[PDB]
Design a protein around this ligand. Structure first.
Ligand SMILES: [Zn+2]
Ligand SMILES: [Zn+2]
Lengths: 66, 147, 196, 196, 118, 136, 47, 59, 118
C-alpha cells in the first residue's frame, strides 16, 4: 500500500529511498546501478524496493468518508 | 518460425481485446440481443377464452438501469456502487410493445413496463462497460474489475 | 451438394438405382441429426472449413470427418455451449500467421479478432480437433501438421499460471496450490474502503 | 428423455416419460407416418447386413398395419378407460408434444421426427454389429457448458409464461365483468421482477 | 519399468556418495529411492487405473500425436525428471496419472469409518 | 515454518479483518408501526446499561471506538407481532475490534438501512497458516 | 450526532438537528450519509 | 403439535359426522383419513404412502 | 345446469372415474358455467385447481387403480366451501342431499402427492 518504513529482515530504513529509486528507474536507468549507488547492498532491502506496488496512490480516490 | 515473443504477442492481444471473463459476457449479450425477442416470438400471441379479445406482442426493449424512488417516480438512473451500498438490485426495466386486439381491431400499439431484469456488470446493458478510467474512478467503481 | 435422406430413399425406391452406390457414400450429420449423404466426407469437410475461414460461413460452425474403417460420417456442429480453443492454421508446414502479421500486432494495427477474421487463427471444438494434428512449437512443425498452438503454457488456468516453474513440481502440489491460493490475504479491490 | 433398448431377442423397444411400458420400434414408426415396413427398413439404414436385424421388430409389429392401429396401441398405454377416439387424440397429443419436441411439436413435423428415430436405431445396430464403440460421456464432443445466457433465457421464458398466464386470467375476469380496456393497469409487472 | 529402474540406478551411481537428499533417503528420514529416481533420473510411465493413458480422441490420447500411435512417449511415459522439467504433454500425462489419489483418499476415509463402526 | 518475529513487529504480514452488521427499519402492517432506531431505556429483553455506553444518541455507534465482546452497535426496538422488544445488534462475543465505518441509507421501500463495519487487527502469531505458491 | 454527505468524497457535513423526509442532505439529493469521527482524543498504542 | 391438533380436530369432525346421521361411505372416508393421519403421526416416512407436508411444503 | 356438475362430483367421489376424465368433464362444465354464470365458473376453476394441485403426476393419474379413499376425503375437505357455494347457487333436492352434510375441515398438514419441485 505504502512503502514500509523499515526493511522487514533488517531494521534498515528504506522508505526515504522509494522516491529517488522510483523516479530514477522510471527515468530510464537500470535498477541495479540505482540500487547500488543509492545505498542498499543487501538483497533483503532490494526486494523491499524492487517489489513494491504503491497502492496508496489509487486508494486516495476510494477513501472512507469517516 | 515464431519465437516466444511473437506468440506471446498473439496471446496478449487475445487477453487485451477479449477480457478474462468473456463467456459470461458473450452469453449475456447473446441473450439480450437475440434471446429476449426469441422468447417473445416463441410465445407468439396471447389468446384468451373469449374469442373477440386478443393480444399481439410486437417488440421488447430494455432501458438504462434505474430504480423507482417513489410510487410514480421518473426512474432515475443509478450506479452499481449505489446498488451495492443501498442493497438494491442493479436491474434495468423492460418495455414490451404489445398491441391490443378488441373486437378484432388492431388499434394503436402500446409499450408497457413488464418488469426489471438484473443485468451483468461490464456488459452491453450497463453504461459502465465503456466508461473511461477517470469516469470509473469518479463514479466509484474499481477500474480493474472484469465484471 | 448434400442429398437429403428422404430424397436418397425416394431415388432408390421410386427410381431403380444401385444401393451399393449410396452405401459407399458418407453420411452427413448436423447437430446430431442425420442431414443427408455426400460423395466423400473429406472434400465436404474441407469445403466447409475453407468457407468458414474465408468469412463466407459463420465462425461458429465446426465440421469433422470420422472415416472409421467400418463407418464414415461428417459431423457439423453449430450449437451453443461447445468449449473451443484457438489454433494457428498451418498450411504446407508453414503457419498462416507471418512476420508481417506479428509486426502489425506489435505496432497495434491489427488485433486477435482481426487475425481470426482473416482466417489465420481458428477456434476449433473437440469434434473438429479429432482430425486435427497439432504441433507445440514451430520447430516441431511438419507438412503433415494441420495446426499450431498459440501458447504452449495456455493449457493452464488462472491459478495454475500463478506457479513459477510448475513443471518441476508434482501434480498434487500444483493442485493444492490452486486450492489454497484462493484463501490468501491481499487487496481484493482498490475501493474496499467504500464497499461494504 | 427417450430411451431406446435392444432386448435379448433382436426386438427394439422405444420408451419415454409419459408413456408407461416399452413401445415397439415399428409400431411407433408407423404411428409417426410410415405405412409399410420397407420405408422403415430403408429409413434405418441402407446396408442389408444391418437392415436384417429389424425383422423381429417388424413382425412384432406385424399386426399393426395402419397408422391408427399404432395410434390406439399407444393410446391404450397413455390413458386407459376412454373411448377409441379419445385414445387416438391423447396418443396424438403425447406423440406430438412429448416425443421429440426439439424437432417440432406440430403434426406436420411428425414425419421428420420419425426419420430421426430411425437414425437413432441405426446407431444401436452399429453398436451391436461391432462397428462402433460406445460413446464417451467424458468426451467434450458430447458435453456442453451452459453459461448465464442459456440459463437466464430459460428463466425469462418461465417468468414470461407465468406473467402471460396471470395476464390472461385478469383480462378474462375484467372482460366477463366489464372494466377498463387499457392494459396499463393490468400489467402486474412484479410477477417477473421478483421471480427472476 | 526396466528402463525406469535402470535410469534410477544410473542416477544414483553418478550421484554424490553423501548428499542431504541422499542422507534423508537412506536413513529413512522422509525419502525413498523412487523419489530420488523421479527427481533426478526420470519420471517414468504414468498409468491411470493401472494402465497407460488411453482417454482422449479416437486412437489418440492427445491431439498432439499421430493417429493410432502406440509409441511410449504418446501414452503417458515421461522421460524427463523434475529437475530437468516436464514437456507440456508430459505434464498433462503426469497430472492425469496423479488425479486418482485426490478422490481415492476421500472415498477410503468413509469406507474405513463405516467398516470400523461395524 | 519459523517466522522472524522482528519482521512481524515491522509489519511483515499484519492484516485487518472487516465485519459488517446491517439492519433495516422494516415497517409491517399496522397503525404507523415501525422499528425505530433509538437507544433503549427500560423495555423488555434489556441487555444491561453497561452494554449501551458507546451507543450514540441517534442509536448507532460512532466510528473509531473500541468494541469489546457483546457491545451493541445499533439500538433497535421492535413492536410485538402478536411492549417493545430488543432486536438490537450485539457484537459477536469472540470478536473484538474497532468500529471502522457507519453508513445510513434509505431502502427502495422506504425503510432506514444502517450498516456498521468493524475492523480487527491481526498480527501473525503461532498457529497462523501460511502457504507458498507451490502447495507448501 | 453530526453526519457527512457521501457525494464525491466527504461532501460537507450534516447535523441531526436538520429534519428532512427520509435521509437526505439539504445540499444535494444523494441518499447516502455517514457518521463522522467523534471529536475525542483516541489513545492508539503502537503495539 | 401440528400433527396432533390435526388428528384431534379431524377426530372431532368424525364424531360430528357419526352423531349427525351421515351416510356410511363419507364416514368410512373420514375414518380412512383419520387412520392415515395417525399412521403419519407415527413414522411419517413410510413407503407406499405420501408423507404429510407443512404449508411451506417441507415434509 | 348445476345438476350435471353435482352428478359429476358424485361420480368422481365414487371413484368410478379417474383424474384426467374428471378434469376434462369439469373443464367442459366450467365452459358451460362461464356461459351461464362467471361465479360458478370461478368456483369450478378453484375446484379443479385444488384437484390438480393434489392430483398432479399421481402414481395412477387416471389409471385403472382406484384413488385412495383418504385422498378423496382430504380433497373434498379442501373444496368443501366451494362445493357448498356451488350448491347454494342452484339447489337440487337429490344432488344436494349428499353435499348437505360435508363440511370444511382445516388441516395444518396435507397429503399432497405433488411437491414444490414438481
Ligand atoms: Zn534489509
Ligand atoms: Zn450533499
Amino acid at each position: 500500500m505504502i512503502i514500509p518504513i523499515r526493511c522487514f529482515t533488517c531494521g534498515a530504513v528504506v522508505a526515504d529511498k522509494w522516491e529517488p529509486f522510483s523516479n530514477r528507474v522510471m527515468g530510464g536507468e537500470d535498477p541495479e546501478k540505482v540500487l547500488t549507488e543509492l545505498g542498499v547492498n543487501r538483497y533483503c532491502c532490494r526486494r523491499m524496493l524492487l517489489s513494491h506496488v504503491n497502492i496508496i496512490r489509487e486508494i486516495i480516490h476510494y477513501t472512507r468518508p469517516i | 518460425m515464431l519465437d516466444t515473443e511473437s506468440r506471446w504477442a498473439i496471446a496478449e492481444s487475445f487477453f487485451k481485446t477479449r477480457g478474462l471473463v468473456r463467456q459470461h459476457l458473450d452469453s449475456f449479450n447473446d441473450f439480450l440481443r437475440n434471446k429476449l425477442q426469441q422468447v417473445i416470438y416463441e410465445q407468439g400471441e396471447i389468446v384468451t377464452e373469449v374469442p373477440g379479445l386478443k393480444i399481439k406482442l410486437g417488440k421488447i426493449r430494455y432501458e438504462k438501469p434505474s430504480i423507482r424512488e417513489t410510487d410514480k417516480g421518473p426512474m432515475r438512473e443509478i450506479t452499481p456502487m449505489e446498488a451495492r451500498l443501498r442493497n438494491l438490485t442493479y436491474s434495468s426495466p423492460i418495455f414490451l410493445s404489445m398491441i391490443p386486439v378488441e373486437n378484432n381491431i388492431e388499434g394503436e400499439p402500446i409499450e408497457i413496463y413488464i418488469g426489471d431484469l438484473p443485468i451483468m456488470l461490464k456488459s452491453v446493458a450497463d453504461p459502465t462497460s465503456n466508461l473511461p478510467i477517470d469516469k470509473l474512478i469518479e463514479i466509484g467503481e474499481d477500474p480493474k474489475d472484469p465484471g | 451438394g448434400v442429398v437429403s435422406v428422404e430424397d436418397v430413399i425416394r431415388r432408390i425406391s421410386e427410381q431403380n438405382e444401385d444401393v451399393e452406390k449410396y452405401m459407399s457414400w458418407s453420411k452427413v450429420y448436423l447437430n446430431g441429426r442425420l442431414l443427408g449423404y455426400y460423395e466423400d466426407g473429406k472434400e465436404l469437410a474441407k469445403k466447409i472449413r475453407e468457407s468458414r475461414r474465408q468469412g463466407k460461413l459463420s465462425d461458429e460452425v465446426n465440421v469433422a470427418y470420422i472415416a472409421t474403417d467400418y463407418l464414415n460420417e461428417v459431423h457439423i456442429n453449430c450449437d451453443a455451449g461447445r468449449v473451443r480453443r484457438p489454433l494457428i492454421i498451418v498450411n504446407n508446414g508453414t503457419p498462416l500467421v507471418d512476420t508481417e502479421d506479428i509486426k502489425k500486432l506489435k505496432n497495434g494495427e491489427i488485433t486477435f479478432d482481426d487475425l481470426v477474421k482473416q482466417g489465420k487463427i481458428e477456434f476449433i471444438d473437440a469434434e473438429e480437433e479429432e482430425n486435427a494434428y497439432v504441433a507445440l512449437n514451430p520447430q516441431d512443425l511438419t507438412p503433415d501438421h494441420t495446426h499450431l498452438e498459440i501458447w504452449p503454457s495456455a493449457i493452464l488456468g488462472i491459478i495454475a499460471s500463478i506457479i513459477p516453474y510448475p513443471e518441476h513440481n508434482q501434480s498434487p502440489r500444483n493442485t493444492y496450490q490452486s486450492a489454497m491460493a484462493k484463501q490468501s490475504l491481499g487487496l481484493y479491490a482498490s475501493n474496499y474502503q467504500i464497499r461494504t | 428423455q427417450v430411451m431406446i433398448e435392444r432386448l435379448k431377442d433382436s426386438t427394439i423397444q422405444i420408451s419415454f416419460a409419459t408413456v408407461p411400458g416399452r413401445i415397439p420400434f415399428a409400431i411407433i414408426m408407423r404411428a409417426l407416418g410410415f405405412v409399410t415396413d420397407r420405408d422403415i427398413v430403408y429409413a434405418v439404414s441402407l446396408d442389408p447386413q444391418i437392415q436384417n436385424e429389424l425383422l423381429p421388430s417388424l413382425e412384432q409389429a406385424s399386426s399393426i398395419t395402419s397408422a391408427e392401429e399404432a395410434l390406439d396401441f399407444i393410446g391404450n398405454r397413455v390413458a386407459i378407460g376412454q373411448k377409441r377416439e379419445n385414445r387416438i387424440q391423447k396418443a396424438e397429443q403425447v406423440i406430438d408434444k412429448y416425443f421429440l419436441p426439439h424437432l417440432g411439436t406440430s403434426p406436420e413435423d411428425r414425419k421428420k421426427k420419425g426419420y430421426y428415430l430411425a437414425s437413432a436405431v441405426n446407431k444401436i445396430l452399429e453398436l451391436y454389429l461391432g462397428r462402433r464403440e460406445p460413446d464417451d460421456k467424458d468426451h467434450y464432443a458430447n458435453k456442453r457448458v451452459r453459461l448465464a445466457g442459456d440459463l437466464f433465457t430459460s428463466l425469462f421464458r418461465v417468468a414470461f409464461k407465468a406473467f402471460v398466464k396471470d395476464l390472461v386470467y385478469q383480462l378474462e375476469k375484467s372482460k366477463v365483468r366489464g372494466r377498463r380496456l387499457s392494459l396499463t393497469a393490468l400489467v402486474r409487472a412484479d410477477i417477473i421482477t421478483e421471480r427472476i | 519399468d526396466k528402463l525406469r529402474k535402470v535410469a534410477g540406478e544410473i542416477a544414483t551411481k553418478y550421484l554424490d556418495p553423501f548428499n542431504n537428499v541422499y542422507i534423508m533417503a537412506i536413513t529413512g528420514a522422509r525419502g525413498s529411492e523412487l523419489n530420488i529416481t523421479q527427481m533426478t533420473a526420470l519420471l517414468g510411465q504414468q498409468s491411470v487405473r493401472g494402465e497407460r493413458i488411453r482417454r482422449g480422441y479416437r486412437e489418440r490420447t492427445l491431439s498432439l500425436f499421430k493417429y493410432g500411435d502406440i509409441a511410449p512417449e504418446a501414452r503417458g511415459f515421461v522421460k524427463n525428471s523434475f529437475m530437468r522439467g516436464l514437456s507440456p504433454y508430459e505434464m498433462f500425462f503426469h497430472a492425469a496419472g496423479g488425479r486418482e489419489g485426490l478422490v481415492d483418499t476421500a472415498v477410503k476415509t468413509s469406507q474405513s469409518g463405516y467398516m470400523q463402526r461395524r | 515454518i519459523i517466522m522472524n518475529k522482528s519482521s512481524i513487529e515491522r509489519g511483515m504480514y499484519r492484516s485487518t479483518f472487516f465485519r459488517l452488521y446491517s439492519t433495516e427499519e422494516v415497517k409491517y402492517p399496522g397503525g404507523q408501526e415501525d422499528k425505530i432506531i433509538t437507544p433503549e431505556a427500560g423495555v423488555k429483553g434489556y441487555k444491561g446499561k453497561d452494554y449501551y455506553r458507546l451507543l450514540e444518541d441517534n442509536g448507532v455507534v460512532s466510528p473509531e471506538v473500541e468494541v469489546k465482546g457483546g457491545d451493541v452497535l445499533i439500538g433497535k426496538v421492535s413492536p410485538p407481532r402478536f411492549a417493545k422488544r430488543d432486536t438490537s445488534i450485539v457484537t459477536r462475543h469472540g470478536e473484538n475490534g474497532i468500529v471502522d465505518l457507519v453508513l445510513i441509507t434509505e431502502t427502495l421501500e422506504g425503510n432506514k438501512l444502517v450498516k456498521v463495519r468493524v475492523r480487527d487487527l491481526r498480527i501473525p502469531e503461532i498457529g497462523d497458516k501460511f502457504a507458498t505458491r507451490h502447495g507448501q | 450526532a453530526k453526519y457527512r454527505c457521501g457525494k464525491c468524497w466527504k461532501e460537507l457535513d450534516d447535523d441531526q438537528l436538520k429534519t428532512l423526509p427520509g435521509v437526505r442532505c439539504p445540499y444535494c439529493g444523494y441518499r447516502i450519509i455517514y457518521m463522522v469521527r467523534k471529536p475525542t482524543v483516541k489513545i492508539v498504542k503502537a503495539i | 403439535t401440528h400433527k396432533l391438533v390435526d388428528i384431534i380436530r379431524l377426530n372431532e369432525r368424525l364424531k360430528e359426522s357419526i352423531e349427525a346421521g351421515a351416510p356410511q361411505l363419507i364416514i368410512e372416508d373420514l375414518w380412512d383419513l383419520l387412520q392415515y393421519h395417525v399412521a403419519t403421526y407415527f413414522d411419517n416416512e413410510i413407503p407406499g404412502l405420501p408423507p404429510a407436508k407443512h404449508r411451506s411444503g417441507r415434509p | 345446469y348445476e345438476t350435471h356438475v353435482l352428478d359429476d362430483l358424485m361420480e368422481f367421489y365414487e371413484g368410478v372415474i379417474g383424474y384426467p376424465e374428471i378434469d376434462l368433464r369439469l373443464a367442459g362444465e366450467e365452459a358451460w358455467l362461464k356461459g351461464v354464470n362467471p361465479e360458478l365458473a370461478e368456483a369450478v376453476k378453484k375446484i379443479i385447481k385444488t384437484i390438480r394441485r393434489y392430483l398432479e403426476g399421481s402414481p395412477y393419474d387416471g389409471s385403472e387403480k382406484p384413488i385412495p379413499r383418504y385422498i378423496i376425503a382430504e380433497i373434498f375437505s379442501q373444496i368443501a366451501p366451494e362445493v357448498q357455494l356451488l350448491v347454494n347457487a342452484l339447489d337440487t333436492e337429490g344432488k344436494y342431499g349428499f353435499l348437505k352434510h360435508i363440511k370444511k375441515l382445516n388441516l395444518n398438514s396435507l397429503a399432497m402427492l405433488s411437491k414444490n419441485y414438481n
